[PDB]
Subunit: 513 residues, 2 copies
């Protein structure tokens, strides 16, 4: 009848946003509010859970007030989706409704000692011991290790645990808790897959893992899908109930990388997204059955629409230095000044003429994990210029992605059918060309690039009947928002050669210690 | 009495100069004229011999005109010495008096094939085969291979061979021939030691070699010392006879790198010099007996003052990319703009903090000859800046010269007492400090830096009794032209660490073919 709108809370590492999308999947209003990055020691990072909750609320009330000044057809938000920085863990009290300490963040390094103890003592030296259950290697990122650290180092949490009032929760859970006025204690399957406490095969908490890591299953929320009724907004913090004005359900919850996957329409097996940010996170939909990596890639849940609905699994890989390599070239090396110069210099030469730049500044991830690898350049002559170096860095980003996809293809027994791309470095047209030529598939670049926020709003809007199927979602995207297609365009001969150069160059990168 | 003057023709790779020195060894007039760098195919370089001769003549006629306005008593120049780019080889007609073609330059690569043929069919695959004779391995650099290339590819040149009218000569011989009006056909011992046709101990042409390399000895000039009567200037080419005013003897002839050794007063065994130009050339006086090398280093004539005066020998080493690396960082890479920024940036950081930059853009020479090595950088992090990369490049030039000097010590069985340094890069105070620290010797930087041109002036002055002995030469020098001295200051530990890092990075540099 009148015109529908869906809100998406995008709670990121350094800021929170609220985006209102209309039924055409167009973003029509936004507000953004940053939160404090607390660093008590080197490699430590922590957030204030209440500052994050208030930011979400502020983002909502402002974005809503702005929409109703500029859109006379806007009445209400039909539902809210949440998407979030994953692994970041919150500990709060069930009766005080308040956190017991700050929330260690996904890249925080304090769980390091715990990590070594777990590998040595529960995995006999094997960090992969539980990987056929969780999908994950023992690592500092995952929520169980941060939870364990809070019990061992934060008296309040230890206390809270004894009295049976301790709640643990990833940011999704924390937000649905407070936004509910304390009524919902839930997590979606995607975020739960990052806790090191979930069994990928059942999508339920693993009793054995909770025993062995000594995390009481009492502290954990209920696992649900990404799209269903979770709760209603029942708080008026920073005037959010008054902004929403009518009763508003929360009907979408999804981890950020997964959300980008869903927002990029990667509904079928063999469909992948890559986000070209500071680094790169590539997720591929591998289908309804989990796949485990022989190459160190993570196995995770991609999404699940409806309680106990079809569950689609995914493989995930990453590179550390993408956007960061570009910034390095500019600010540390002075290779260009205006952002546009990066692409224009790289296009000014026809190739790299034999050089390889492996920008492994913080080592190698992906399917050749090597933390001793460093940034390295080989093959230079007095004809090499900054143009060749810039182009080579771009090529390296694409080559590492090619390796990650090759690994996923073998682990999943499938092909890559296409690659959707987002992040700021996706605006580098030449990088997108090189990447298509290497992968041999079309690259799709959405002109509506708010993919993460979109993922959550799609989940929400689906559960709320704004869109009635995944096919309709796609057809609406295809009708309303432009996509650019970038098709392969070099030679197989050139590709083979650039790959042979790359593989050699990788042997020269071991340095540190 | 009456202020005597001595003229030096300094005939370089990209230009020619004439410098008039007084008997106090002060340069009192100079003029410079550039000549054309013909590159007909990639890796080929040729000079027009007539343009060079003309450049020299113009240089003489102008520098004199300018002196005589500074000193209107000046009526003549006591003698002329010549110092020249070595190996570069001219072909000319005994009766046209004109060149038959362009002169392939020392670093020209057209003699590649011929070079392989010679090692194969004449050295039994051993390129050192003639090294106890010549002091030199087979290489594109040396004059006999160019002579051969000219006989096998220039109609005019095979022709003049057959009609027995053909002369070959390095640049010293070309200059002396034309300056004479065709009357002298001579070369000094230093230049002749670079032809691959002179026996190093006997300083005589080797009939074995001219026969085997198939070069008719009728074409070769007569070997003399560096210091004695070669001819007179009898040409009027650019008013030069007129401007000389009185009949003028040529009494100095000496290869540029040895002329620098001589011009830095390295008269004693174990005294040595490095020229820090585009590349580096290090020569060490090894004394009255030739020393041969286990490390690829060249054995050559240092100097001989007089028809059977004593011949002092030298060991010689090079690196391809010294000043070229500095210019590359700027013009190819945009790492700095004004030349002083190079030093300021490198001193703005405490060290290279983990990285090594091996600038083997055109391969490694010296005692690890490897043409497959390419420019390479290892160990970078997101903290590495251009300042580290610049410093690294300076460390690496000095580390190459440390490797060269080490090799020379073994070969020669002597120490290095100190190092005289010249070239544009010797004005880099940081680079001198690091070099000193690595060698553990003093480095001496002359303020009268025209050491190459001085060399030739010294040789001609001595033969004409402007100066009466080497001891007179030095005392004049020590009294008239000062030095900067740069002392070492490392820890045996800084030094061992640097080298260890350095030797590790070298294993990573192999790339081409």
């Amino acid at each position: 009848f009148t015109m529908k709108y869906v809100g998406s809370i995008d709670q990121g590492t350094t800021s929170t946003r609220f985006i209102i999308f209309d039924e055409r999947q167009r973003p029509v209003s936004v507000h953004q509010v940053p939160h404090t990055q607390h660093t008590p020691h080197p490699g430590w990072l922590e957030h204030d859970p209440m500052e994050i909750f208030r930011s979400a609320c502020k983002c909502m009330s402002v974005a809503i007030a702005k929409l109703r000044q500029k859109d006379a057809s806007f009445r209400k938000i039909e539902a809210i989706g949440i998407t979030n920085q994953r692994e970041t863990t919150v500990a709060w009290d069930r009766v005080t409704k308040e956190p017991l300490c700050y929330a260690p963040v996904w890249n925080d390094l304090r769980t390091y000692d715990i990590t070594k103890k777990v590998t040595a003592e529960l995995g006999g030296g094997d960090s992969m011991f539980a990987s056929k259950i969780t999908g994950l290697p023992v690592s500092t990122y995952f929520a169980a290790f941060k939870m364990r650290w809070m019990l061992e180092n934060v008296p309040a949490v230890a206390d809270a645990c004894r009295r049976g009032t301790l709640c643990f929760g990833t940011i999704d859970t924390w937000l649905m808790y407070k936004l509910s006025g304390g009524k919902a204690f839930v997590t979606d399957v995607t975020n739960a897959s990052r806790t090191f406490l979930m069994d990928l095969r059942t999508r339920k908490w693993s009793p054995e893992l909770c025993e062995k890591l000594k995390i009481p299953m009492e502290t954990l929320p209920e696992i649900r899908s990404n799209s269903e009724l979770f709760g209603y907004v029942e708080t008026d913090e920073c005037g959010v109930a008054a902004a929403l004005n009518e009763r508003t359900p929360i009907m979408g919850s999804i981890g950020d990388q997964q959300s980008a996957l869903f927002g990029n329409m990667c509904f079928e097996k063999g469909e992948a997204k890559n986000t070209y940010g500071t680094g790169c996170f590539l997720l591929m939909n591998v289908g309804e059955e989990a796949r485990f990596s022989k190459h160190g890639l993570l196995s995770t849940v991609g999404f699940q629409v409806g309680r106990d609905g079809p569950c689609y699994y995914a493989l995930e890989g990453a590179i550390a230095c993408a956007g960061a390599t570009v910034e390095w070239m500019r600010r540390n090396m002075n290779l260009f000044s205006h952002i546009t110069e990066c692409e224009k210099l790289a296009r000014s030469v026809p190739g790299t003429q034999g050089i390889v730049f492996v920008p492994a500044f913080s080592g190698l991830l992906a399917p050749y994990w090597d933390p001793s690898a460093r940034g390295t350049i080989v093959g230079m002559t007095l004809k090499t210029t900054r143009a060749h170096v810039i182009r080579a860095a771009l090529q390296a980003i694409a080559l590492q992605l090619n390796d990650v996809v090759g690994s996923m293809k073998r682990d999943a027994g499938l092909n890559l059918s296409s690659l959707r791309v987002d992040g700021g470095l996706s605006k580098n047209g030449l990088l997108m060309e090189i990447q298509a030529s290497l992968l041999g598939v079309d690259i799709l670049v959405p002109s509506m690039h708010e993919t993460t926020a979109l993922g959550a709003a799609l989940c929400a809007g689906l559960a709320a009947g704004v869109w009635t199927s995944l096919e309709e979602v796609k057809a609406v995207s295809r009708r309303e928002n432009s996509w650019k297609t970038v098709s392969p365009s070099g030679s197989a001969m050139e590709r083979e050669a650039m790959i042979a150069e790359w593989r050699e160059a990788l042997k020269r990168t071991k340095w540190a210690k």
